[PDB]
């Protein structure tokens, strides 16, 4: 799998996942004030934390833009 | 909170969460050859099994459909 790696609004970037157990996610939430998104190659979906907003974790290759 | 609770393709319902600790979900997996969603309210975001398309965790209400 290839999944999306780049932080919040910086330029897009990818990466190609270590396994084929892998899969992608990306995860937003707000720090103090502040807006902030994760994204990448996880072979487990993330919890979703009290200050975040949503967690999302996908299968397809690029599905966590 | 308040989250979509329908399965799959039947007509849409809601549910109110027990606990503030709570947000909705929708997981999205093929069974077979055969595509189901679950939606509903949790404490805990799904686990993205071998066999899940997605997983999805997400804090608004009706945010899940």
Redesign the interface.
Known sequence: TKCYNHQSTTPETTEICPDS?Y?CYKSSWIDGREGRIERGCTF?????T?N?????????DK?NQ
Chains 1, 2 share one sequence.
Do not use: A, D, I, S
């Open positions: 157990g899969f487990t979906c993330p919890e979703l009290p975040g907003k949503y967690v999302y974790c996908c299968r397809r599905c």
